């Protein structure tokens, strides 16, 4: 994705990894279409929560803009209002 | 004849609606009697996650992709059997829609 | 194993690897006695369903016809009917 | 005096039966109190695979082969201690049938 | 290492290779001192259990008497009573 | 900025007790805060062996040998502020005794 967005995610990485429950978010992103069954497997294949979060973000970093937006919308639909707000500035300008 | 990409894609697309609406409380026996899984597999799908309905449903539709070509409509039939006519009709009409459009 | 069988198995290797779960199949193949504890351990060490299936088939390809048939019936008993149908045409007949 | 190949053959041929019927729940304590395994070995076996009864059982009868010559009779005794009489009777019947049949 | 020490090792290398779990043994052998992190790494990096066992044994053979003793003690501490007994009549006194 | 041979000797001499009694659950965050391990290395510690707390501990005390001459005090402190008092006292005592014993 755009370097700006990547920078935003990296700017709030530790902030995300402490609060995010991967299950619901990954449900959303899979529904949107920016997360495969394999990737979901290798994320869910982690024993603790923070590890799953870490892996998930680590994967999103390699993806594109629409992935970032899907992730933001996931955060926003699942009650993570302030984290979504944290990612709001990094949302790629549309065209 | 493994499950075609249209079906897997259809399961992944409405993954949310499935892990939300799907009642698994009665599904198991019908899943067994229509030969989608075997008992120990059902045990696995039931133990998955925390054991909540959502986690169970999720693991179910995740494992459903591996059960062959006709695994999806068979599954739909199960939904029809447990009185989930609504969700079933949704999935069925959407699959029928998907099949009639290509490329 | 025979050429026809080996060719069949290769020709359906990826179709197999996308679906099958080794945990289930290997029990049957262990019971039949055409799969060893060591080979089972080598497969189980793999980090993915796909990779495990791949290692399993890699093991089986270096084996005889009986091992192939064991793998086939293992698929059959565990509900993998379609994949079994795929491997069926390349089953070495008895004269 | 390592575990003889007849016993190993026995544990392997009846793998399905074991992992299907075995009740590992009350079995752990007994396994320890007969010194079949050290404690950390037990806790290692308990977390094998998905942690399901089936997986635990599998790893149990796999690692059992390394415990010595009288590992299998000891294990059967464990099965009898926990009240799993059908399975234990099966194992004794086939072990005796096997070692009397040789050559 | 020695005469019938190593000869006893070769006498029963099969059972040892196909039974023991190097993970549990190498901890004791490390804590006793007759094994190193490098050798432990060399053994830990093997695909199968029996290969780890075989590597470990290969390394044991090159070592000396007290190493044999510590190997015995590891086997005994970990519950490999049969194998330990099978190794008993091979302990030097040097 | 390289660990002494004596400290290595200590981490190897008490390899068993460490692997037995180390609690690595609340340890990660402090380990990263106290800057004892790099995140890459911790990431490898967690994934060593089978994920078993045992072998995680093993790989931890193995990787501890490549963290300088201040590794043991910092680690012991990490033990302290995560409520692992007795282990800390044991390591501290044995270490100081080891220092004092060699002229």
Swiss-Prot record, chains A, C:
**Cellular localization per UniProt:** Cytoplasm
Q: Which residues cross the membrane?
A: none
Task: Specify the inducers.
Answer: By E2F and p53/TP53 in apoptotic neurons. Translation is inhibited by HNRPA1, which binds to the IRES of APAF1 mRNAs.
Cite the record's tissue specificity text.
Ubiquitous. Highest levels of expression in adult spleen and peripheral blood leukocytes, and in fetal brain, kidney and lung. Isoform 1 is expressed in heart, kidney and liver.
Domain CARD, residue spans: 1-90
The subunit field of the Swiss-Prot or TrEMBL record says: Monomer. Oligomerizes to a heptameric ring, known as the apoptosome, upon binding of cytochrome c and dATP. Oligomeric Apaf-1 and pro-caspase-9 bind to each other via their respective NH2-terminal CARD domains and consecutively mature caspase-9 is released from the complex. Pro-caspase-3 is recruited into the Apaf-1-pro-caspase-9 complex via interaction with pro-caspase-9. Interacts with APIP. Interacts (via CARD and NACHT domains) with NAIP/BIRC1 (via NACHT domain). Interacts with CIAO2A.
Tell me what else is known.
Answer: Physiological concentrations of calcium ions negatively affect the assembly of apoptosome by inhibiting nucleotide exchange in the monomeric form.
Q: Report the domain remarks.
A: The CARD domain mediates interaction with APIP. The monomeric form is autoinhibited in a closed conformation through a bound ADP at the nucleotide binding site. Exchange of ADP for ATP and binding of cytochrome c trigger a large conformational change where the first WD repeat region swings out, allowing the NB-ARC domain to rotate and expose the contact areas for oligomerization.
Its job: Oligomeric Apaf-1 mediates the cytochrome c-dependent autocatalytic activation of pro-caspase-9 (Apaf-3), leading to the activation of caspase-3 and apoptosis. This activation requires ATP. Isoform 6 is less effective in inducing apoptosis.
**What is this protein identified as?**
Apoptotic protease-activating factor 1
The encoding gene is: APAF1
Residues represented out of the complete protein: 1 to 95 of 1248
UniProtKB/Swiss-Prot annotation, chain E:
Where is the protein localized?
Cytoplasm
The membrane spanning regions, by residue number, are none
Q: What induces it?
A: By E2F and p53/TP53 in apoptotic neurons. Translation is inhibited by HNRPA1, which binds to the IRES of APAF1 mRNAs.
Q: Where does the signal sequence lie?
A: none
How is expression of this protein distributed across tissues? Ubiquitous. Highest levels of expression in adult spleen and peripheral blood leukocytes, and in fetal brain, kidney and lung. Isoform 1 is expressed in heart, kidney and liver.
Q: Which residues form a coiled coil?
A: none
Domain CARD residue range list: 1-90
Domain commentary: The CARD domain mediates interaction with APIP. The monomeric form is autoinhibited in a closed conformation through a bound ADP at the nucleotide binding site. Exchange of ADP for ATP and binding of cytochrome c trigger a large conformational change where the first WD repeat region swings out, allowing the NB-ARC domain to rotate and expose the contact areas for oligomerization.
- So what does this one do? Oligomeric Apaf-1 mediates the cytochrome c-dependent autocatalytic activation of pro-caspase-9 (Apaf-3), leading to the activation of caspase-3 and apoptosis. This activation requires ATP. Isoform 6 is less effective in inducing apoptosis.
- Assembly with partners or alone: Monomer. Oligomerizes to a heptameric ring, known as the apoptosome, upon binding of cytochrome c and dATP. Oligomeric Apaf-1 and pro-caspase-9 bind to each other via their respective NH2-terminal CARD domains and consecutively mature caspase-9 is released from the complex. Pro-caspase-3 is recruited into the Apaf-1-pro-caspase-9 complex via interaction with pro-caspase-9. Interacts with APIP. Interacts (via CARD and NACHT domains) with NAIP/BIRC1 (via NACHT domain). Interacts with CIAO2A.
Q: What else is known?
A: Physiological concentrations of calcium ions negatively affect the assembly of apoptosome by inhibiting nucleotide exchange in the monomeric form.
List the protein's name: Apoptotic protease-activating factor 1
Which gene codes for it?
A: APAF1
């Amino acid at each position: 994705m755009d370097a700006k967005a990547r920078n935003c995610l990296l700017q709030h990485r530790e902030a995300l990894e402490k609060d995010i429950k991967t299950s619901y978010i990954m449900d959303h992103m899979i529904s949107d279409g920016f997360l495969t069954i394999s990737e979901e497997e290798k994320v869910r294949n982690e024993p603790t929560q923070q590890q799953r979060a870490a892996m998930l973000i680590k994967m999103i970093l390699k993806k594109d803009n629409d992935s970032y937006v899907s992730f933001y919308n996931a955060l926003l639909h699942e009650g993570y209002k302030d984290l979504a707000a944290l990612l709001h500035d990094g949302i790629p300008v549309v065209s | 004849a493994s499950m075609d990409e249209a079906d897997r894609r259809l399961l992944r697309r409405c993954r949310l609606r499935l892990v939300e609406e799907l009642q698994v409380d009665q599904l198991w026996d019908v899943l067994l009697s229509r030969e989608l899984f075997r008992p120990h597999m059902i045990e696995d799908i039931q133990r998955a996650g925390s054991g909540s309905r959502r986690d169970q449903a999720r693991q179910l539709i995740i494992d459903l992709e591996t059960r062959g070509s006709q695994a999806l409509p068979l599954f739909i039939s199960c939904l029809e059997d447990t009185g989930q006519d609504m969700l079933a009709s949704f999935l069925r009409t959407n699959r029928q829609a998907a099949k009639l459009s290509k490329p």
